[PDB]
């Protein structure tokens, strides 16, 4: 009885926007405490409840639950207004009291208005300089972790702090940055206002992080639910660098993030889309520029939501799954967006790439070769019919419980649920 | 199914707890010896039969001949300093190392420029605020901070396409210099020396996550991985911002290596009998007096190779206890016991006061930590020399109490106690 509880986690199994906001959204209807361990906005959740859309970003999908605590751990970089500006967004959609039952971790870190600013401008430049950039969402977060790892960012703790030691911190940092791109502009007397009353505003929801998750862990059995941001292969260390963003999306972002210990992780649920999508730049075998990429782009709504730019679509890919499975050890999956498939006569799934017709032994690390391999498909047999009002596994059309098989059996996770619908009842439980 | 465990060493206070000696006495019978995080900013010695060696890079079961040193995605190289450690060792008997060390090919590079920009930021913190962290120099926190901002360079990218590769890394070094217009940077000389480096190194070179996930999944092994630098030097949880640039804590071990949770076995923690930090930064129990001078005298507190003299203060349980909730520890290796051979009281730290009342917790703000007042528990002393302690029963009654009360304050069981540099110089309890 020495270890605590174990924390359920719900993280990405390609390039982000699987669907991790509708899995967790669905595991917190009872959990006592939802929680973000890494990333910052530049991630996108959606959840959808009783004919309402909701749109998170900073905030943990779980902070829809009344009775249940939302926190945001240490390893979240934080953009105040960003925060607050999401806050009020679902104000106006009939979120009450949520200050009340959200708790933020000291110890993240803050994106300032000029890390975001510098993020803009690095990939301009990056864009004018090698004719390619990296494809990031510009919201500051590679520059705060990279503020971070420098140990010259700032944190929550600072802010409340005596904010004289922490205006002298602030100007620091944005010399240095202004340094960095003399044609950066900061108005570090505005911003620093503004910051004296995002202070007094997120004071009253601010805690130690690692005591409050301790005690939540050792104490009377509590159900905690960790809520990955973005996806296996976007980590930092192990997706497809440097078209990744800048945090570890991976099982050990929840430790780090957290700070808690292996022995307070239970299952670990891997979201996988049924097709697969990326928004960025980067490597994407089975991408499918024609009539199947439209196909799923439209019938997927893959597209930005404020920005409307439609992402990259294409067919499954194994080789990307069991890859990332390797790194986060999933327990069981969340197969998502299965009824977009129902109107193809053939699916086609990517098992394994190929150089010189011979079948490479893993994923490559050096990014480059993901642009020269051939992907091997197989291609299934599709159900033809309208999946998005099943419930139970009977409800299924043959081929489409044969597609679920195919995933189980060749990433040798079992699939727990099925998703085929935006909404929280567009569900299958299967176990 | 799952696959087997690995073993944990992790730091639990400062650094320099003895993490070296436990690893090299647990890679006795470990078929693989790893490091996950940092880079040779970190040090640790190993002494076996009348030989003293200071590893850096290379991971402490490079000694063993019959296992297998891997260095994870985690740590960032610097090829100069890696070779010039392989080199100062093989003076010492290290042979055919290369053999049997194994990179991970998703590791990031530490570049020369790095360490320049390293001392560079350090020198500039101490003419403004007359105050800086007290980096080893080496660059870690700048190579750290090119690979959060997805610009630094990776073993796999120095073995592939070199024009690609020389093109990156000349933006790089621009990038660098704006930083600092007073940085050099002799972009065909380094580039040239990485050249040679590359293939030096390439056949050492493998796929991590792979490796790894075999090595875990095929016939039963054992795996060891090392912790560098230490819980309260964690990038997230220690005394930021003076703390290393990496997850010194546990959770690195799975975003340095590529592993699960579930493939992670004991975690050790190492801590010394008392309490040492370098560099600058609140240090609580922090002895400056007659007992300091004592403990750093009698524990050869000094730069192992940075050439600075540690700070020194009594044990110090509420840092034990935060790096214990972060890291999970299964067991702990109580270090240079032998330290305490000649006092005749031992204070161990047990609570911060601030402003005559406990806090409940170990602050975020490390500035607080520098006007708290430390709560003692004083112990006897045993004043009796155990260096040549090899059992339990060979330590003097009080001698016992304290590792008891460590055990004890700690709810996590002593392992092993160290008496003596040497690696016979260990008491296994459990
Ligand atoms: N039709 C359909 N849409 C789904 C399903 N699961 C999720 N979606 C939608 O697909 C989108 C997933 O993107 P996003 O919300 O960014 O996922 P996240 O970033 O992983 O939380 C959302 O708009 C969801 O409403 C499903 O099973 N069927
Ligand atoms: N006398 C004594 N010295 C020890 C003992 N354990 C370790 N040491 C020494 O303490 C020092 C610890 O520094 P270091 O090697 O940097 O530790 P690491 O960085 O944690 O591997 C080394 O010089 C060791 O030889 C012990 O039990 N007794
Ligand atoms: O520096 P960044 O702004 O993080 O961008 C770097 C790279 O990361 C990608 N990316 C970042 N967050 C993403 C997301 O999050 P969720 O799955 O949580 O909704 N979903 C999809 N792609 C995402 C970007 O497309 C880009 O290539
Ligand atoms: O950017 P860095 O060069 O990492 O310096 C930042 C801070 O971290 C400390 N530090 C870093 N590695 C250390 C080490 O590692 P081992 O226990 O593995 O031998 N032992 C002790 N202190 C160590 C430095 O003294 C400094 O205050
Ligand atoms: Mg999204
Ligand atoms: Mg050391």
Redo the contacts between chains.
Sequence with gaps: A??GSRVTVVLGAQWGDEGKGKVVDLLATDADIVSRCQGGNNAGHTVVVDGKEYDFHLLPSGIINTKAVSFIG??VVIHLPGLFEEAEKNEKKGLKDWEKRLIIS??AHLVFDFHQAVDGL?EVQRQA??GKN?GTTKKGI??T????????GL????LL?DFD?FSARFK?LAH?HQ??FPTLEIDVEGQLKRLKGFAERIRPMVR?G??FM?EALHGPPKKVLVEGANAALLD???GT????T?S?C????????L???????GD?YGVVKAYTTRVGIGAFPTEQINEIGDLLQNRGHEWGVTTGRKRRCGWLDLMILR?AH????FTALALTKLDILDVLSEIKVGISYKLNGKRI???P??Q?ILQKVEVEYETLPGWKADTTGARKWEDLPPQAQSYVRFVENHMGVAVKWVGVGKSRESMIQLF
């Design positions: 020495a270890t240490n390893g000291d110890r690095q300089q090698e990296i590679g520059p972790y990279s503020s971070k790892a420098a140990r010259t944190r929550i703790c600072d702090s030691e620091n240095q340094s960095m130690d690692v005591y301790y930092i260390d192990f660098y440097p078209f990744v800048s570890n991976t099982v050990g972002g929840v430790c780090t993030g700070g808690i210990p292996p022995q307070n992780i670990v890859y390797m790194v986060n050890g032994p893993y994923f690390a050096n480059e």
